[PDB]
Design a protein around this ligand. Structure first.
Ligand code: 1GI
Length: 89
């Protein structure tokens, strides 16, 4: 989670929409802003808080799915990797 990364133009436009201001991040900080995007947009369900629904949301489009579990860390990593580039420092 200390690997430095640059999100692609669309994810950047997603994180900067919830208060982000860097162009270079770590996985930690990216997950935090995705968290706030999820708060901000009420994507987190109250009936069961294991599923984020994003089918009508730009996140669904970046992620390629209508919904995912917040416990499916391996699939979230994957979906997010496909949306960034790694940098030196
Ligand atoms: C560490 C993993 N993050 C998490 N893990 C576990 C767990 O393992 O229990 N529960 C989690 N609950 C949340 C969460 C998310 C949004 C909201 S909004 C109100 C409460 C709340 C709680 N997150 C954060 C999260 C952030 C971004 C994304 Cl995209 C997906 C999940 C959890 C990470 C994927 C690798």
């Amino acid at each position: 989670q200390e690997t430095l990364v640059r999100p692609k133009p669309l994810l950047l436009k997603l994180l900067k929409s919830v208060g982000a201001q860097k162009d270079t991040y770590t996985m930690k900080e990216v997950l935090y802003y995705l968290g706030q995007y999820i708060m901000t947009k009420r994507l987190y369900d109250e009936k069961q808080q294991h599923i984020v629904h994003c089918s009508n949301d730009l996140l669904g489009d970046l992620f390629g799915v209508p919904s995912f579990s917040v416990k499916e860390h391996r699939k979230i990593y994957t979906m997010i990797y496909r949306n960034l580039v790694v940098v030196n420092q």
